[PDB]
C-alpha cells in the first residue's frame, strides 16, 4: 500500500504525515518504535498510536 498510504498522507497535516513517515520508515527505510517517534515529536507513545489509528481508518475507506 505505497500509493494508498500516500493518498492518505496527502490528507494529513505536515506534522501527522511526518509522524507516519518516521513510523513506517518511508524515507530512511527503517521503521521506528512509537517511542522513537514520540521522542522526535515530544509526545507520548499513545498520541503516536492515535495518529497511526487515524491513518489506518483513512486507509480503509476510499
Amino acid at each position: 500500500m505505497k500509493e494508498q498510504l500516500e493518498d492518505v498522507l496527502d490528507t494529513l497535516t505536515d506534522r501527522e504525515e511526518n509522524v507516519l513517515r518516521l513510523r513506517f520508515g518511508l524515507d530512511d527505510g527503517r521503521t521506528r518504535t512509537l517511542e522513537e517517534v514520540g521522542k522526535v515529536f515530544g509526545v507520548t507513545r499513545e498520541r503516536i498510536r492515535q495518529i497511526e489509528a487515524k491513518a489506518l481508518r483513512k486507509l480503509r475507506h476510499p
Binding site: 511526518n18 513517515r21 518516521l22 512509537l34 521522542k39 515530544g42
Partner: peptide, 30 residues
C-alpha cells in the same frame, strides 16, 4: 524494543535535545 522504549522513556534532557535536532533535520531532508 521494550528495553529501547523504557530507556527512551526515562532518558536525560540532553538525549531529548539530540532527538529534537534530528527531527528537524529529517523535516529538512523531506
Amino acid at each position: 524494543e521494550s528495553q529501547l522504549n523504557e530507556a527512551l522513556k526515562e532518558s536525560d534532557f540532553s538525549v531529548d535535545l539530540t532527538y529534537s535536532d534530528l527531527g528537524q533535520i529529517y523535516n529538512m531532508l523531506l
